[PDB]
Amino acid sequence: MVSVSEIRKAQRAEGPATILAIGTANPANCVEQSTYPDFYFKITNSEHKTELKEKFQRMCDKSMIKRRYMYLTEEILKENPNVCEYMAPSLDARQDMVVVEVPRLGKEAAVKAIKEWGQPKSKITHLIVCTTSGVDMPGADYQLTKLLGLRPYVKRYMMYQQGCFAGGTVLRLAKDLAENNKGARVLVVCSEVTAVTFRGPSDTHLDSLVGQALFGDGAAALIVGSDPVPEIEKPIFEMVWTAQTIAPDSEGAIDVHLREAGLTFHLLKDVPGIVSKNITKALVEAFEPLGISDYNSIFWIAHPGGPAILDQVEQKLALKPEKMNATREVLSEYGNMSSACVLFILDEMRKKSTQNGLKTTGEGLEWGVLFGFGPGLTIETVVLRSVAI
Amino acid sequence: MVSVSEIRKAQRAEGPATILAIGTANPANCVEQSTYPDFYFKITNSEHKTELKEKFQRMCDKSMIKRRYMYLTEEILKENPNVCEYMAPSLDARQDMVVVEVPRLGKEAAVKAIKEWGQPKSKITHLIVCTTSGVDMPGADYQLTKLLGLRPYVKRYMMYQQGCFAGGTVLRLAKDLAENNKGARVLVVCSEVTAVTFRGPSDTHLDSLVGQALFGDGAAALIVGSDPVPEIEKPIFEMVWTAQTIAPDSEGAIDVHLREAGLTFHLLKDVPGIVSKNITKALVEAFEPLGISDYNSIFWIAHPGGPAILDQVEQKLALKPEKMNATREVLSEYGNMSSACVLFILDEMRKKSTQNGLKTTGEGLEWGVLFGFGPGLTIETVVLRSVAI
C-alpha cells in the first residue's frame, strides 16, 4: 500500500550541501610563543634541563606560531602537579576539565554561527560534535543540546577521539546529512582543548615535546544545509565532493593513546614528507573529473599540522606563496587547534576575501580544496565551490 | 563552466538504504548465568559478602539471560586484580585488552557479513565502526581497514563512546551514506567488549552491580547499500525513516564516565518507566505518517537494556507476548551487548523468518520498528520495511 519510492523522493534534499554560517571561539588566556619556553620549563619544574630547553626554544622558534589560547593557566597547573609531570596518573583531573570546557567553548562558537545564520535554532535538525579532548556519556553533543536549547529530537553525531584530520571528517559527514534530508540544517561544532595532552618534557620523548610547542585551544561552528532560502540564508561555500585515504608507507606516523596519564602523542615517521608525497594523487582524484590541473587556480585550505607540511606541499606543487596565506595566518594567531583549524581557515578566507573586495569567498576563485591530515596517516579531501561576493 | 547540479544528480543514489548482509561474532569463552554469581564473587574476592551475593543472585535470576560470551576469563582476571576491584586504577590494562579485542571481534563479524554479501571487499566504499569499549588513535576503523584489506580510501566513521542506543545510531548514519552516494556500500560494525566496564561489587553501588549481571560481549556487521543489484545482491530489510530524541524528565538516568578506573555505569532514574512512558510518542512520530496505529501489526526490535524495559513496553502498548520473541531470544543467548544487540536481533528475526518459510523477513509482516535506548535518556527509532521471502 505505502510507496517507499514516494517517501524517498519527498524526504531528500535537492542541491549541494552549503556552509551558511561560521563562528569561532577560544579560551581567554592568551599565551605568547616568544615567552613560552620560559613559562613551560618553569611550570613543569624543568629549568635545570638546559639542553632540552634549548631544543624546545628551537621548536617554538620554528613553529611559525605567534600565540595560542589556552584553558590551562598557571593557577590551574599549580593545582595539578600530576599534569605538569611528563607521565603521572592524571586522566580524571584532565577529564574533569575538558568534559565541561569542550561544550563551554563549543557553545560560544555555536551561538556566533547561529547569530550569523539568523534562523530559529528550532530549525537545526542535526548536530555533529567533534573533539579529540576527553570523552563522556551522555557526550558533549548532549551537553551542547542542553546548553544551546536545541530541540530534544535533534539528530546527533558524537565524534570522539578523532584526531587532526577531523575538520575534513565533519564536513564529509555534514554533506551527506544535509543533501539526503529535505530541510535539514546541520550545526557542526569542533571544540579542542589541550588539557588532556599537556605534559612535562622528557629528553627521550622529543616527539611528545613538539606537541607542546604546537597545540592550542579553540572551537569552530558551522551551519550546513542544502537548498538555501534565497535572500534569507546566505551561502558561503558549497561542498561538491569528498574523499578520505590512508597514505602508503605511513603506519605509526602519528599514534595517540588515551591512558591514565592523559593523551600521549607519539611520532614515528616524516609527516611533511608523506603528506607532500601523496598530496598530488589526492588532487588529481578530486580535480581531474572537473578538468582542473592548475593547482594555483583553486583556493586552498590545509590543516597546519606544522609549518613543514605547508612548506613541503608548497614546494612540491609549485604553489604561489600566497596560496597558504589564510592557513598560515590561522597557524600564526592560534597554533594547531586540531580538528577546528580548517574551519577557522575557512572563516579567515571568506572574511579576508570580503574585507578586501574580492569577487568570491574563495579569494576571487571558483573552486577550492580543503585538506585534513592526521593519524593513520589519513588525508581528508573536500572540494569546495566559492560564492559570489 | 562546471555544473554542480549535474554532478549532484550523477553522484547520488536512488532507492532506500537496504541491509544486504548481516554477520555476528562473540568471544569463545561462554559464561553460564546460572552459576555466574559464584564465579563473579570468587574472582572479585567478595565471597564473604553474603548478603550482596544474594542481591546479585536475584539480579542474575531476573535478568532473563542464560549465558554471555566474554573475552575476560578467570586467568586474565587473576593477572589483573585492579580490574577485579570495584574502584582501582586500571584503565591502561583495560585499554590494552579492548584496543585489540574490539577490532579482532569486529573482523570476525565483518568477514561473515562479506561472505554472505558475496561481492568483492573492494566495493566497500564506507566503513562505520562503533564501540563503547575503549578509544585509540588511529581508531578501530583504521585497524579494521588493515585487518580486512579494505581499500585505503574507504570513507571511515569512527563512533566511539556511544552507548547502548548506538545500534540505532549506526543505522541512521548508514542510511544517509548509502542513499546520498551512488554505488556506495557501507560496512557497519558494532563491537562491544566488557573489559572496560567489568569491576568488583560494592554494596553501596547496586546500580553498578546490575551491569555485571547484564553486559556481554559481541560484534555484529552489516552491509548497507541503496540500489541493490537484483538477484546478485539480496535485500534483507529496507530503512525508511529515522529519529533520535531525548526523553523529558530523564536527566542523569544513565551516566557513564571513562576514568582511570575504567568505565563506570551509574543509574539515577527508572529507565523502564521512562522508556515505557515515551515509547508511544516515538511510535506515533514514526507510524502516523504511514497510517499505522496498530503496534501489533508491525515487527519489533528493541534494545534489551534489561528485561524490565521489555516487559514495561509490552504492558504499556498491550503488545502480544510474541512481538518481543526475537529480542528476548538474543537477550537470553548473549545478554546485553550494548550497540550490537539490535543487530543481533535483526539477524535472529530474518533467520527465523526465512528458516520457517514466513512470507517476509520481518516475521511475515510488512513494516517494523527498531529502537535503541541509552544515555541522555536517548531513544533511537528506525522504521524498517521487510523483504518478501
Helix (H) or strand (E) holding B132: none
Q: What is the topology classification, in CATH, of domain A236-388?
A: Peroxisomal Thiolase; Chain A, domain 1 (3.40.47)
Residue B162 C-alpha, separation from nearest chain A C-alpha, in angstroms: 7
> Contact B239/B17 with Cβ under 8 angstroms?
yes
Q: Which residues of A touch B5 (CB under 8 A)?
A: 15
Give yes or no for a contact between B264 and B199, defined as CB atoms under 8 angstroms apart.
yes
B308 is in an annotated binding site: yes
| Distance separating alpha carbons of residues B342 and B167, to the nearest angstrom | 6
What are the sequence ranges of the domains in chain B? Answer: 2-235, 236-388
What are the angstrom distances between the C-alpha of A236 and each of A228, A295, A332, A335, B318?
A: 11, 21, 24, 24, 52
SS3 readout for chain A: CCCHHHHHHHHCCCCCCEEEEEEEECCCCEEECCCHHHHHHHHCCCCCCHHHHHHHHHHHHHCCCCEEECCCCHHHHHCCHHHHCCCCCCHHHHHHHHHHHHHHHHHHHHHHHHHHHCCCHHHCCEEEEEECCCCCECCHHHHHHHHHCCCCCCEEEEEECCCCCHHHHHHHHHHHHHHHCCCCEEEEEEEECHHHCCCCCCCCCHHHHHHHHHECCEEEEEEEECCCCCCCCCCCEEEEEEEEEECCCCCCCEEEEEECCEEEEEECCCHHHHHHHHHHHHHHHHHHHHCCCCCCCCEEEECCCCHHHHHHHHHHHCCCHHHHHHHHHHHHHHCECHHHHHHHHHHHHHHHHHHCCCCECCCCCCEEEEEEEECCCEEEEEEEEECEC
Across the interface, do A260 and B260 touch by the CB < 8 Å criterion? yes
| Contact state of A158 with B159 under an 8 Å Cβ cutoff | yes
A245·B4 Cβ contact <8 A: no
Nearest to A155 among B136, B162, B244 (CB): B244
**Phi (first) and psi of residue B29, to 5 degrees:** -70, 105
The catalytically annotated residue of A30, A84, A130, A164 is: A164
What is the nearest CA distance from A51 to chain B, expressed in angstroms? Answer: 31
**Are A304 and A327 spatial neighbours (Cβ–Cβ below 8 Å)?**
yes
| B11: Cα separation from own chain's centroid | 31
Which residue from A10, A196, A26 is spatially nearest to A109, judged by alpha carbons? A26
Cα dist from A347 to A138, A192, A343, whole Å: 30, 17, 6
Contact present, A76 and A93 (Cβ < 8 Å): no
Tell me the chain B residues in contact with residue A180 when contact means C-beta distances shorter than 8 Å: 12, 175-176, 179-180
Hey, what's the cell of A73? 593557566
- Three cell numbers written together for A275: 603528506
- Nearby residues of A5 by Cβ (< 8 Å), 6 or more positions away: B15
Are the Cβ atoms of B153 and A245 closer than 8 angstroms? yes
Angle between helices A307-317 and A271-287 (to 10 degrees): 50
Method used to determine the 3D structure: X-ray
Q: Which three cell numbers mark A76?
A: 590551574
Residues of A in contact with B291 (CB under 8 A): 1-2
Buried b (16+ CB within 10 A) or exposed e, A73-108: eeebbeebebbbbbbbbbbbbbbebbbbbbbbbbbb
Asked if B36 and B62 count as a contact pair (C-beta separation under 8 A), the reply is no
Distance from CA of B313 to the nearest CA of A (A): 21
Out of A156, A247, A256, name the one closest to residue B137 (CB): A256
Min CA distance, B377 vs chain A (Å)?
Answer: 8
Q: Which helix (H) or strand (E) holds B291?
A: none
- Does A385 sit within 8 Å of B138, measured CB to CB? no
CB A347 within 8 A of CB A142: no
Show residues of chain B in contact with A246, CB under 8 Å.
142, 145, 152-153
Q: Find cell 538477484 and name the residue.
A: B231
* Angstrom distance (rounded) from CA B191 to CA B25: 9
| Alpha carbon separation from A223 to A21, A124, A126, A230 (Å, rounded) | 5, 8, 10, 16
Residue A307, C-beta contacts closer than 8 angstroms, at least 6 positions apart: A62, A63, A64, A328, A331
The alpha carbon of residue A389 and the mean position of all alpha carbons in its chain are separated, in whole angstroms, by 25
List of chain A residues whose C-beta atoms are within 8 Å of the C-beta of residue B248: 152
Residue B130 is among the residues annotated as catalytic for this protein: no
Q: Which residue from B67, B96, B100 is spatially nearest to B82, judged by alpha carbons?
A: B96
Which of B84, B130, B164, B341 is catalytic? The answer is B164
Show binding-site residues of A: 55-62, 197, 216-217, 308
Q: Say yes or no for a CB contact (<8 Å) between A154 and B254.
A: no
The rounded distance, in Å, linking the Cα atoms of A164 and B321 is: 50
In a 13 Å sphere around the CA of B171, the CA atoms on its Cβ side amount to 34
Contact B255 A142 (CB under 8 A): no
Which of A157, A163, A375 is facing B173, going by the closest CB pair? A157
3-state secondary structure (DSSP) of residue B384: strand
| A111 within 8 A of A189, measured Cβ to Cβ | no
Residues B375/B258, Cβ–Cβ less than 8 Å: no
From the candidate CATH numbers 3.90.800.10, 3.40.47.10, 3.40.50.2300, 3.40.1370.10, the one assigned to the domain spanning A2-235: 3.40.47.10
Whether residue B305 contacts residue B373, with contact meaning beta carbons closer than 8 Å, is answered with: yes
Q: Which three cell numbers stand for residue B202?
A: 560494592
Q: Measure CB to CB from residue B244 to each of A14, A156, A162 and give the nearest one.
A: A156
- Rounded to whole angstroms, the Cα distance separating A140 from B335 reads 28
Annotated binding residue B62: yes
Check A242 against B4: CB less than 8 A apart.
no
Distance in Å, alpha carbon of B180 to nearest chain A alpha carbon = 6
Q: Is B109:B222 a contact under the CB 8 Å cutoff?
A: no
CB pairs under 8 A between A and B: 171
Distance, in Å, from the CA atom of A117 to the CA atom of A104, rounded to the nearest integer, reads 20
Closest CB to B375 among A92, A138, A245: A138
- Give B264's contacts in chain A (Cβ within 8 Å): none
The whole-angstrom separation of Cα A314 and Cα A214 is 20
Q: What is the resolution of this structure in A?
A: 1.5
Q: Which of A67, A64, A94 is nearest to A79 (CA)?
A: A94
d(CA B253, CA B250) in angstroms, rounded, equals 5
Residue type present at position B249: D
Phi and psi (nearest 5°) for B131? -155, 155
Handedness of CA A162, B19, B348, B314 (dihedral sign): positive
Q: At what angle do helices B50-62 and B206-214 cross, to 10 degrees?
A: 50
When CB atoms are compared, the residue of B4, B92, B154 closest to A238 is B4
Task: Identify the burial level of B273 via C-beta atoms within 10 angstroms of its C-beta, where 0-12 means exposed, 13-18 middle and 19 or more buried.
Answer: middle
* B23 annotated as ligand-binding: no
A304 residue type, one letter? P
All three cell numbers of A383, joined, read: 572540494
The residue of chain B with its CA nearest to that of A383 is: B4
Q: Which residues pair with B74 in a beta bridge?
A: none
Q: Cα–Cα distance between A52 and B189 in angstroms, integer?
A: 45
Q: What residue of B is the nearest CA neighbor of A91?
A: B260
Q: Do B378 and A138 touch (CB under 8 A)?
A: yes
Of A135, A180, A375, the CB nearest to B160: A135
Asked if A190 and A133 count as a contact pair (C-beta separation under 8 A), the reply is no
| A158 vs B165: CA distance, rounded Å | 13
| Crossing angle (nearest 10°) for helices A140-148 and A91-117 | 40
Say whether B4 and A385 touch across the interface (CB within 8 A).
Answer: yes
- In angstroms, the CA A172 to CA A242 distance is 6
Question: Using the beta-carbon criterion (under 8 Å), do A375 and B238 form an inter-chain contact?
Answer: no
Confirm if A173 and B157 have CB atoms less than 8 A apart.
yes
- Residue B242 carries which DSSP code? E
Please return the burial class of A299, using the count of CB atoms within 10 Å of its CB with bins 0-12, 13-18 and 19+. Answer: buried
Grid cell listed for A319:
604553489
**Residue A59 CA: distances (Å) to CA of A71, A266, B286:** 22, 16, 56
Closest CA to B311 of A210, B259, A61, B302: B302
DSSP assignments along B14-71, one per residue: -S--EEEEEEEE--S-EEESTTHHHHHHHHTT-TT-HHHHHHHHHHHHHS---EEE-S
Nearest Cα of chain B lies from the Cα of A34 at a distance, in angstroms, of 31
Buried b (16+ CB within 10 A) or exposed e, B112-146: bbbeebebebeebbbbbbbbbbbbbbbbbbbbbbb
Work out the number of other CB atoms within 10 angstroms of the CB of residue B35. Answer: 10
Are A254 and B137 in contact by the 8 Å Cβ rule? The answer is yes
Cα separation, B325 vs B323, whole angstroms: 6
Closest approach of chain A CAs to the CA of B48, in angstroms? 31
Q: Is residue A63 a contact partner of residue A213, using CB atoms and an 8 Å limit?
A: yes
- Most B CBs within 10 Å, among A100, A176, A254, A292, to test the B interface: A176
Alpha helices in chain B (DSSP H): 4-11, 36-43, 50-62, 74-78, 81-84, 91-117, 140-148, 166-179, 206-214, 271-287, 307-317, 325-334, 341-355
Instruction: Give the residues across from B385 on adjacent strands.
Output: B238, B367
Which among A197, A229, A224 has a CA at the least distance from the CA of A213? A197
SS3 state of residue B231: coil
Q: Tell if the CB–CB gap between A256 and B15 is shorter than 8 Å.
A: no
Q: How far apart are CA A334 and CA A343, in angstroms?
A: 12
Rounded to 5 degrees, φ, ψ at A36 are: -65, -45
Residue B60 is assigned to a ligand binding site: yes
DSSP 8-state assignment for residue B253: S
Q: Nearest CA to A264 among A30, A94, A75?
A: A94
CA distance B292 to B278: 18
The answer to whether A370 and A222 are in contact (CB under 8 A) is: no
Flag if A153 and B241 touch (Cβ within 8 Å). no
Contact by Cβ (8 Å): A41, A212: no
Q: Angle at CA B128, nearest 5°, toward B123 and B129?
A: 125
Q: Which chain B positions have a beta carbon within 8 Å of A177's beta carbon? A: 176
User: Cβ neighbours of residue A92 under 8 Å, at least 6 residues apart?
Assistant: B259, B260
Distance of CA A377 to the CA centre of its chain: 16
Q: How many CB atoms lie within 10 A of CB B51?
A: 8
Question: Strand B378-386 and strand B367-374: pairing?
Answer: antiparallel
